[PDB]
Each structure stands twice: as structure tokens, then as C-alpha cells.
Structure 1
Amino acid sequence: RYHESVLEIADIFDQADFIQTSDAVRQLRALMPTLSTSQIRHAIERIAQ
């Protein structure tokens, strides 16, 4: 009897210049599709472009 579930680091730590935990950023991430590292890299490359 248990529930396996993900726990974000933001939901553990809350240091101001370490782990961004603004509810703004929280909900904004909640909007994001699941991400691989290649996806993130594609994002950075796009912003840079």
C-alpha cells in the first residue's frame, strides 16, 4: 500500500540563488512537455538563435 510518485527538487530545497522556486516558474514548468536533454539543448540553441 503506497503511491510511487515524482518529487521535484524545488519541492525539497528552496535556496534563492540556487533553486528557482517562484510559483510563477513552478506553473510555467507545469506547462512544459516532458523534456530530454536534447530538448533542453534545442531550447537553448533556439533562444540563442
Structure 2
Amino acid sequence: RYHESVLEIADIFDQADFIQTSDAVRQLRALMPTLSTSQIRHAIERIAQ
């Protein structure tokens, strides 16, 4: 009886001031294609200028 796929949000600290971000930021990252070193450098430059 197989597994599945979920996320934790790091709620198992119950300790405030940490774990500010949530689940959704990972979904956006995985949604992204893939970024190479020179592509990231280009992307930083474009948003800056």
C-alpha cells in the first residue's frame, strides 16, 4: 500500500521567528524550468537594470 507526496512547511518546531516562508514557494520553484549559472546571472542583471 504505497506512499504519496506532501509538504511539511517545517511546522514541527512550533518555535516562532523561524520558518517564515510557507509551502507555496517550493511549488513556484518546481514550476520553473531549470536555470543555468549564466541564465541566473542574466536574470539578476535584467531585474536590476
TM-score by structure 1 length? 0.49
Higher relative contact order (CA 8 A, sep 6+): 2
Q: CA RMSD in A?
A: 5.1
Q: Structure 1 residues 24 and 9 mapped into 2: Cα distance closer, same or farther (>3 Å)?
A: closer
Identity of aligned residues (%): 100
Shift of 1:3: 15
Deviation string for 1:6-43 (max 9, x for gaps)?
A: 99999999999999863221011011111110111111
Task: Kindly tell me the number of residue pairs found equivalent between the two proteins.
Answer: 49
Cα–Cα, structure 1 residues 41 and 16, in superposed 2: closer, same or farther, change >3 Å?
A: farther
Structure number, greater radius of gyration: 2
- The answer (yes or no) to whether the contact 2:9–2:22 under 8 Å persists in 1 is no
Change beyond 3 A, Cα 1:5–1:28 = closer
| TM-score normalised by structure 2 residue count | 0.49
* 2:19 counterpart residue number: 19
